[PDB]
Amino acid sequence: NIGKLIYMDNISPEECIRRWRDLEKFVPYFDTFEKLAKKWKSVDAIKERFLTWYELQKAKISKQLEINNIEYQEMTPEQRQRIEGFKAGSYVRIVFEKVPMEFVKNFNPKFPIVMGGLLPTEIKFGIVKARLRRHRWHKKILKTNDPLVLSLGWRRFQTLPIYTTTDSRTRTRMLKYTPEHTYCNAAFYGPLCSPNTPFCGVQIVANSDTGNGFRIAATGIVEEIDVNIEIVKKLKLVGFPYKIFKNTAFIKDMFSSAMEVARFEGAQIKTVSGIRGEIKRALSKPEGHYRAAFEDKILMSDIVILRSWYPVRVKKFYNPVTSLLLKEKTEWKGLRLTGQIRAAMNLETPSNPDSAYHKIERVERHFN
Amino acid sequence: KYTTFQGSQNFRLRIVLATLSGKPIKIEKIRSGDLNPGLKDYEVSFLRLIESVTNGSVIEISYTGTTVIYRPGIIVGGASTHICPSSKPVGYFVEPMLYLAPFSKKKFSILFKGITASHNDAGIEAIKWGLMPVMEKFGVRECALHTLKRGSPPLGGGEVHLVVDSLIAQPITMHEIDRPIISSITGVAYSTRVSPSLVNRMIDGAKKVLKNLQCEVNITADVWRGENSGKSPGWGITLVAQSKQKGWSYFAEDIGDAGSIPEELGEKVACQLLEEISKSAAVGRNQLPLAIVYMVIGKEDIGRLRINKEQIDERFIILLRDIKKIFNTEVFLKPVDEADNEDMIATIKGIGFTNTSKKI
Amino acid sequence: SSFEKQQIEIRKQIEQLENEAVAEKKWSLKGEVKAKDRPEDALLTEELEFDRTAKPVPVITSEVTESLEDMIRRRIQDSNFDDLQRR
Amino acid sequence: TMQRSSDVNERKLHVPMVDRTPEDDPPPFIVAVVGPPGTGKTTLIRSLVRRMTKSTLNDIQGPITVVSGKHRRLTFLE
Amino acid sequence: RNEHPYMLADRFTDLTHPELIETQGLQIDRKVAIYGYLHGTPLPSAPGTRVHIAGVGDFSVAQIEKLPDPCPTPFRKRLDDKDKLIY
Amino acid sequence: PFGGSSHAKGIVLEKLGIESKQPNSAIRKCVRVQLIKNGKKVTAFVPNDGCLNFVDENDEVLLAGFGRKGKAKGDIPGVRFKVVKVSGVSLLALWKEKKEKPR
Amino acid sequence: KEAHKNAVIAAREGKLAELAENVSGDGKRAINYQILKNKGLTPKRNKDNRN
Amino acid sequence: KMMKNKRGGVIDKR
Amino acid sequence: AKLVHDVQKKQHRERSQLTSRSRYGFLEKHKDYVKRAQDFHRKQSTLKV
Amino acid sequence: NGPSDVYVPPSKKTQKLLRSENL
Amino acid sequence: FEARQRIEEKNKESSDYHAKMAHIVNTINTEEGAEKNKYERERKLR
Numbered sequence A: 001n002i003g004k005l006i007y008m009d010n011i012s013p014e015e016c017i018r019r020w021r022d023l024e025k026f027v028p029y030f031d032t033f034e035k036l037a038k039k040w041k042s043v044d045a046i047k048e049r050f051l052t053w054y055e056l057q058k059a060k061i062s063k064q065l066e067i068n069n070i071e072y073q074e075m076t077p078e079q080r081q082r083i084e085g086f087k088a089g090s091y092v093r094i095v096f097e098k099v100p101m102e103f104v105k106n107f108n109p110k111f112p113i114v115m116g117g118l119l120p121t122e123i124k125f126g127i128v129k130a131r132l133r134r135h136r137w138h139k140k141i142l143k144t145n146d147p148l149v150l151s152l153g154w155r156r157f158q159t160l161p162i163y164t165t166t167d168s169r170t171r172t173r174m175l176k177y178t179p180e181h182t183y184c185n186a187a188f189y190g191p192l193c194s195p196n197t198p199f200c201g202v203q204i205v206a207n208s209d210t211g212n213g214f215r216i217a218a219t220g221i222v223e224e225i226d227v228n229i230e231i232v233k234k235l236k237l238v239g240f241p242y243k244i245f246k247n248t249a250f251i252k253d254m255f256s257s258a259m260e261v262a263r264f265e266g267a268q269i270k271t272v273s274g275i276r277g278e279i280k281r282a283l284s285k286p287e288g289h290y291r292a293a294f295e296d297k298i299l300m301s302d303i304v305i306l307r308s309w310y311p312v313r314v315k316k317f318y319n320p321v322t323s324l325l326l327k328e329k330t331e332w333k334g335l336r337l338t339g340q341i342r343a344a345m346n347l348e349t350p351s352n353p354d355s356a357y358h359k360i361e362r363v364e365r366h367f368n
Numbered sequence B: 001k002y003t004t005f006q007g008s009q010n011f012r013l014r015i016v017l018a019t020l021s022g023k024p025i026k027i028e029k030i031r032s033g034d035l036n037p038g039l040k041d042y043e044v045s046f047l048r049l050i051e052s053v054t055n056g057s058v059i060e061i062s063y064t065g066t067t068v069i070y071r072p073g074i075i076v077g078g079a080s081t082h083i084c085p086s087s088k089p090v091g092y093f094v095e096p097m098l099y100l101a102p103f104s105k106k107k108f109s110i111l112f113k114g115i116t117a118s119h120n121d122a123g124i125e126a127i128k129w130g131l132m133p134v135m136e137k138f139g140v141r142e143c144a145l146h147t148l149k150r151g152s153p154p155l156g157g158g159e160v161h162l163v164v165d166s167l168i169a170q171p172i173t174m175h176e177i178d179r180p181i182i183s184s185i186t187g188v189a190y191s192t193r194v195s196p197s198l199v200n201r202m203i204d205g206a207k208k209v210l211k212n213l214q215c216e217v218n219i220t221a222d223v224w225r226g227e228n229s230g231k232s233p234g235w236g237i238t239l240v241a242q243s244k245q246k247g248w249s250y251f252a253e254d255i256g257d258a259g260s261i262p263e264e265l266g267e268k269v270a271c272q273l274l275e276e277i278s279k280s281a282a283v284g285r286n287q288l289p290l291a292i293v294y295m296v297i298g299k300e301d302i303g304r305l306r307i308n309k310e311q312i313d314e315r316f317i318i319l320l321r322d323i324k325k326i327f328n329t330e331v332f333l334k335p336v337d338e339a340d341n342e343d344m345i346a347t348i349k350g351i352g353f354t355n356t357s358k359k360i
Numbered sequence C: 001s002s003f004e005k006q007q008i009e010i011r012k013q014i015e016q017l018e019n020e021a022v023a024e025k026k027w028s029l030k031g032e033v034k035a036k037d038r039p040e041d042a043l044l045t046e047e048l049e050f051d052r053t054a055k056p057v058p059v060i061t062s063e064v065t066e067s068l069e070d071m072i073r074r075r076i077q078d079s080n081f082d083d084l085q086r087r
Numbered sequence D: 001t002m003q004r005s006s007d008v009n010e011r012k013l014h015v016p017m018v019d020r021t022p023e024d025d026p027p028p029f030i031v032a033v034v035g036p037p038g039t040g041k042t043t044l045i046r047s048l049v050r051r052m053t054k055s056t057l058n059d060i061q062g063p064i065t066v067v068s069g070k071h072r073r074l075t076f077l078e
Numbered sequence E: 001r002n003e004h005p006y007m008l009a010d011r012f013t014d015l016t017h018p019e020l021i022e023t024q025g026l027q028i029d030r031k032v033a034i035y036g037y038l039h040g041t042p043l044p045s046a047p048g049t050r051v052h053i054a055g056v057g058d059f060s061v062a063q064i065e066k067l068p069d070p071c072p073t074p075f076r077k078r079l080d081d082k083d084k085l086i087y
Numbered sequence F: 001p002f003g004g005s006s007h008a009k010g011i012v013l014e015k016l017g018i019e020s021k022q023p024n025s026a027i028r029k030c031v032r033v034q035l036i037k038n039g040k041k042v043t044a045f046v047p048n049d050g051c052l053n054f055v056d057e058n059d060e061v062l063l064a065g066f067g068r069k070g071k072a073k074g075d076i077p078g079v080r081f082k083v084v085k086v087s088g089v090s091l092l093a094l095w096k097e098k099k100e101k102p103r
Numbered sequence G: 001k002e003a004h005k006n007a008v009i010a011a012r013e014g015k016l017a018e019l020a021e022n023v024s025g026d027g028k029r030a031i032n033y034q035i036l037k038n039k040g041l042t043p044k045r046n047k048d049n050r051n
Numbered sequence H: 001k002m003m004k005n006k007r008g009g010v011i012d013k014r
Numbered sequence I: 001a002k003l004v005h006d007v008q009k010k011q012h013r014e015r016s017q018l019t020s021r022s023r024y025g026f027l028e029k030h031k032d033y034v035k036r037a038q039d040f041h042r043k044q045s046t047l048k049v
Numbered sequence J: 001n002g003p004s005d006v007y008v009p010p011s012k013k014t015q016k017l018l019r020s021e022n023l
Numbered sequence K: 001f002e003a004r005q006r007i008e009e010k011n012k013e014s015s016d017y018h019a020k021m022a023h024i025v026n027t028i029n030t031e032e033g034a035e036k037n038k039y040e041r042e043r044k045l046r
């Protein structure tokens, strides 16, 4: 009676209490103090209220399961519809509205039609923080902001991940490739699954480009989910000396203006020899030139370095595969890899000429 | 897109259950037919507290102020502080944080700053001794409300450090198919910026009402001296009844004001407590909301808790209607099979809740 | 159909970020930038993060003069004087 | 043999998790036949369903659920 | 699998309206019934439960009518050739 | 050590020392594990920081004794056991990529 | 400049073509040696140790 | 420092 | 190498002087600087003596 | 009068509890 | 101003981290080396 009254939701709650016989106010409703005084002058109404480990865990969970059964043994449309509903092995029809045309048009019964129920978390989007790994049999290394198709829960979706490292647990700063044989972190805009769920990732899902190699590229688990990530890429500002004394030097071009040097005063720099230093004051007439002080006398063949950090953003890109809405259901094509784009529009790969290593030979070091 | 509610009732419970469930809601007609219509300042600052606690949740107040749009986000916690207004004490803002408190990335270390007590709200001793043990046996183990200083109304000036530091996955399934035997009955009588004899007058009034029941009565006494007393005179009394074999508790509090006799207030809170014992069964009339909220966000099992006839009310069933309105779950009230009293046993099958914000 | 609308918009942004991917980098997204690898005084608008060598010299405001004066007043009304004592 | 008994009784212990599969009417266990194109599969699904249900199921498609035990039934798909 | 309600679909149809298709002209996002056994945790019976059909997108359920078992197991012993069924 | 057995199976609680700023420090490659036989929580090593990202949580670990052959330098003496398997797969084989960890 | 550009682009596409025509005769994606023998991440060893 | 890693905000149109 | 891979203890190669800054020959690195500095320090030590 | 109520304030115990041969 | 604030917050972070790591190191030392020495003591009786 009372449950039907509670969940019959076209009648007022005081009408439920009336035909059975507001929460900003925290403390509940009491009588008048005089009525309560004459009511509780007596006391006798409430005087009777006053006065192995593995098998143990399995026993606790089977105790909960028998509690589940013996409390399910109740009203038939209560159990079998609304208090739990359709346990397992129930044969159901399930109707979806606004299913696309292409499914019904191109429905080929070879390809299975699987459906899975999303949790409250898995309908949310945002940055998923994983730790992943180039799969040991995938040949080529993976690159940040190259798409790969993830299989994260029920969904398969192509995303743009960016591989990070917490370099001795200080930053979470941005790599440019995945490592060769171990795990890195990663962050991709996608549907937020729960933490500790595993996933695969694939470069190429089609069959025209299926090649001869191994097709699954990345493996990993999900570490954390969030609405925002704060990851950085290192930028150094390089400048060269042009007037050197003992223990101090005038540094030429890492800044364009004395306002910029004023913005950066007191910062610690270093040469490539590891000589630590500090910038002290902007010089007046040559504009981006400043005066720095070092540990000792630096040389004219050095480069000073201001290690700073620039924030980088994940790219909010997400397309699910929708392979069953195609006329071929293989041959799904998404965003291409960067080498594929360069091969398509014939751009040469970017080569900084002074980034290439050489064979340095030391001259012998003699002093006066 | 939005689950729609009407009126400014149960406002904190609606925003709290929307944050738990992750469902976008609208609350329409916030006192629209009124002389100063719209949201009030204390519930606007509660929205600011929700934006402090969560991250990525967008709240969208209208022009007229009479409808709010809450699209929730991830509970992240962190350390914060909240300078809540004089319209409501710190209990009005620390009560709805005890639901969101164990389900965040980083542990709750917030300190609220304002009035400590009110007639129609939760106190420090209320929050602590009543509402922390039901969480303590629903699954959390490290939760603490500290008073650094307390401020009686109207000027207040008291700070309260809510720290929860057990980030559980989900609350356990409750099984309370008994009425817990009350082992002791204790309490705390506090007074700030007044004479220390008022506390003993309150204690003597409460215990002369309590003296005829054959249990053991113990009321602790604190006067607050110095900067810890706050900016205003005040005094109040909070009794709990303590079932020690399981840990259950039933509380009742109030505060005195300008013209109030302390023996009168002590005996009033004592009789109000005994009536809560009468109208209580394994919970209190005010511990019952978050008890059944933790039962409904437990595991995907059946959890059952005994309640009595008089705990059913318009507040309790409007709570149940809001629960079913947000995440589509029903309670099943089965009666006990013995007939010297009218007690139901509410079985709730909890939704499949986990906290997905805590990093693994 | 609706899937054709979604596929048109998906491939529109796919084309956008593929020519973004094959495009050149920004100045801030390379290490080793000189003054002329980047626009003129672009570091005033940019709010970079760097470590600094020593703490700056403290600015002497009214609060620190007030704290120092009432320190002096406590010492001078308790006669807590660290003077030399004549042998 | 006591050290053998300890070291064998140890590997019965596993992580105690819930089951969530019913015991009254469990679903048909999903059997997936997985092969590279050109081996078995069809011929194999046909042979298994012909042995199991005495019915020549030429020209298969989709999932195929048969009863193969007193309480174990199972679903064949390719 | 044992915290998720899933289902493999052995029967599929569109219960759309063919004269509505004659009205609007085959661009219609049309409704669909999906019949099958379900595994895992109990899928709730209220409409509006969100569901990923793995390969066509995300939807929410509209109505569920559970059906009697088309391939049931019958109630030392052996399995009767009468009861070796096939669906 | 474990009683009468040579190994013991256990449940991974949480990777201790996950905020240690030094790679391959003994604090960092150090896992807390609940043994399943008697329920007690012990602490176990792992071979390196590189194989620290094969255990995550409740992983059904298998752990043997450690056997220090001499007073080490960066040691923390007072951790007795080492992780030798994870989810029924030898993590030295996992570390040299001979097997893949199944879930 | 454009002669050097098409020279290096032609070297890239010639290498990519001669690598991408390593396909087996039929549509049979045969396994290879590192998945077959599974000698994952070994140190460099000795020809004199092989006997 | 309060703004630095926020993503929400109340939208007070009053 | 007890638990270290040989693909992990690889050889990081060192960088050369920039070709724009090439008239000041040989960008010197930390081994060159310590060869400079300890020479200066031993000569200052004998000068101080 | 209740001066002992301030003499039995949080001094030690409530201060710690109100936060939870020869020769 | 940003100089003073960033320096003092970095110092606070480092001094917190060192305390936390030293705490977990010697709690693992004390309350598990007691059990190591207890097992060695009751293994020396055999």
Ligand SMILES: Nc1nc2c(ncn2[C@@H]2O[C@H](COP(=O)(O)OP(=O)(O)OP(=O)(O)O)[C@@H](O)[C@H]2O)c(=O)[nH]1
Residues within 6 Å of the ligand: D035, D036, D037, D038, D039, D040, D041, D042, D043
């Ligand atoms: N010699 C021999 N032929 C076999 C055997 N099993 C299957 N075949 C042949 O495989 C041929 C290809 O058809 P299926 O075997 O049905 O192909 P499938 O394995 O279903 O793979 P798909 O062609 O991708 O569907 C058949 O015509 C069979 O003759 C076997 O054990 N031995």
Ligand SMILES: [Mg+2]
Residues within 6 Å of the ligand: D041, D042, D078
């Ligand atoms: Mg076939």
